[model samples]
Target: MVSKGEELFTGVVPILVELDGDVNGHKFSVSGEGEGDATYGKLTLKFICTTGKLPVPWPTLVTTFVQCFARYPDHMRQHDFFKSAMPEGYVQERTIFFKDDGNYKTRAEVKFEGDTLVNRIELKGIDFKEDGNILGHKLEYNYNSHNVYIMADKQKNGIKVNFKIRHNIEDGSVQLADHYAQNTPIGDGPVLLPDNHYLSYQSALSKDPNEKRDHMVLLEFVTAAGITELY
Candidate 1:
């Protein structure tokens, strides 16, 4: 049963999530969409955190990662290439605020892997920076692609237990581009705002160049049929 372009699954799945760490186990709901192609596949997720006091702005953050299979082994066929099967190798990462369309302010980084085949995509981290400079060459911001977990429920109707992933982003200094300094609250230069609470970003920008503020989002979600199981 080889899958062609049309055979590759494409659809949206309603996801229920729990914000782990810092937020005190706060719970939220969001939806994720997946689309596959003979050449490439894309997966996107949108979520808002109005209820939680987060460092970023309201509606929180929206992230999407792309897996370009142009270099996949030559033996693979069009149908073989069609499956999204979560990204497994180095890929590109994009992140932007919910309201910031056009990806104008979207931060870009490359090379990482997560898995979700059949045209459905998954999330991943970006490259970290030091004093406005990229750090690891190609390594992602403290992330392990293999650590991602997606388990199916016995009912098969949905994933009832867990779907967990985490991404540690750069502090305000690196996240805010120099060109957009005038438009941001923290202004230019480098910033080390705590990743714990929204108020932290407003409280004070860390001056200690060595004072790195740890910020990351740990999410656990449950999917109904669309994601882990290809319908």
Candidate 2:
């Protein structure tokens, strides 16, 4: 999972989103073709003032944090290693966006345990600089494999409704290094991008490699009062 935006849409889900085209002299495309039960949430206590309650919006007034996962592509360095090791396929966290503190543009400086993993994310304040100088890092991820400890968080003034969801991202992916102008020999090249375009590429939208007919086992509720349910 990842914690990095006002948007909680960072994880892989079975939902399908595909596109590749040009509009008004601009280009766009995205694809998330698979299934998974993923839930995303945000914890916001952030408040701002405009002319009346909005004198400003930029340089926000308070600190807000969100947890989510980000995936771009596998590093060529570890590309084939993955191509061979992962039977499900090579899906991984190429970039990570997370926070240990509630500061935006600044790293919170926290680490997940175990010697097999290491997270080395560096940020000057927050957000990326224009020099193409950012590729956040984090502990190693077991994208499609089982076994892990656990993770969780929460909110308020939200809705209370109960329903059911069914999603399954059997497989998903993004093309890096159209270097050969086409999908090339695996693990032999680099993942490239468009010349002068801006893209929102944190979407691991394809999958979690793990999807329940439901997202999780409901043995718990996210609460501070020590009691709650969303239905």
Candidate 3:
């Protein structure tokens, strides 16, 4: 079934997507080792939640898929011939370090890496920052990349999981009409996402369509302990 125009769907790659925190009042941290492929030189990862609950499942179920792209045209461009055309290096714009004092620190960053960008955010054992302070882990991506998705992974009180999402099309075109839902619920009779589009669970428990709950953790909160590379 390899058509001349359908080659981009193959050669898929797996990326790690983890969210550690509490959602509503349910405390659980899960990771989706998901599959993705490049389109326009952007790596898009899809994570779907299809599990059932007995007494209850975690409230506000979520399906998260993200695409990361260069914020500036001069910074990078996508080509069909080449898998990725991002500039060989990246500039770190911000960071969160787990200090030895048993707390977190959020600070602006300007560190540059001469190697190819891997778009990774993981905990390190004892990596130290430029300030010579003990570092927990590093969140490194193109400081120039547009954060096209939403994620909130931090030690917070209220809604601890929020992912800004957009529908992904496979043929490199919008097969389904795309819509945005900040705190919308599935099966609400108006969220007309086609079956082919990736699903997102924002307000699964709220019975009232107008009911609003705390669905976001501050950028400073996640940058303190979550991934921002979006890819």
Q: How many clashes in each candidate?
A: 17, 30, 2
Query: Which residue segments of model 1 deviate by more than 4 Å?
Result: 1-6, 9-23, 34-38, 49-74, 77-231
Please give the CA lDDT of all the candidate structures. 0.24, 0.19, 0.23
Per-residue lDDT tens digits for candidate 3, residues 174-229, read 21111222321111121111111121122211122452422211011010111114
Q: Find the 10 residues in a row with the least total lDDT in model 2.
A: 175-184
For 1-231, candidate 1 gives per-residue lDDT tens digits of 333322323343222222221211232222222332322222333233433433222112322322222212222322121122222212222232211111123322221123243222232223322222222222133332212122222232111111122222343222222111011111222211111111001011112245233223323221111121335
Question: Each prediction's Cα RMSD?
Answer: 19.7, 22.2, 19.9
Angstrom error of the Cα, residue 123, model 1: value is 14
Model 2: runs farther than 4 Å from truth? 1-14, 18-29, 37-126, 129-231
Q: Tell me how candidate 1 scores on lDDT.
A: 0.24
Displacement of the residue 104 alpha carbon in candidate 3, Å = 18
Q: State in Å the error of residue 184, model 1.
A: 44
Give candidate 2's error at residue 78 in angstroms: 44
Rank order by TM-score, top first? Answer: 3, 1, 2
- Give the candidate order by descending lDDT: 1, 3, 2
Worst 10 residues of 3 by lDDT: 217-226
Error of 2 at 126 (Å): 6.0
Question: Candidate 1 vs candidate 3: which has greater TM-score?
Answer: 3
Per-residue error at 190 for model 1, in Å?
A: 52
What's the true lDDT of residue 48 in model 2? 14
Best candidate, lDDT: 1
State how far residue 91 of model 2 sits from its true place (Å): 26
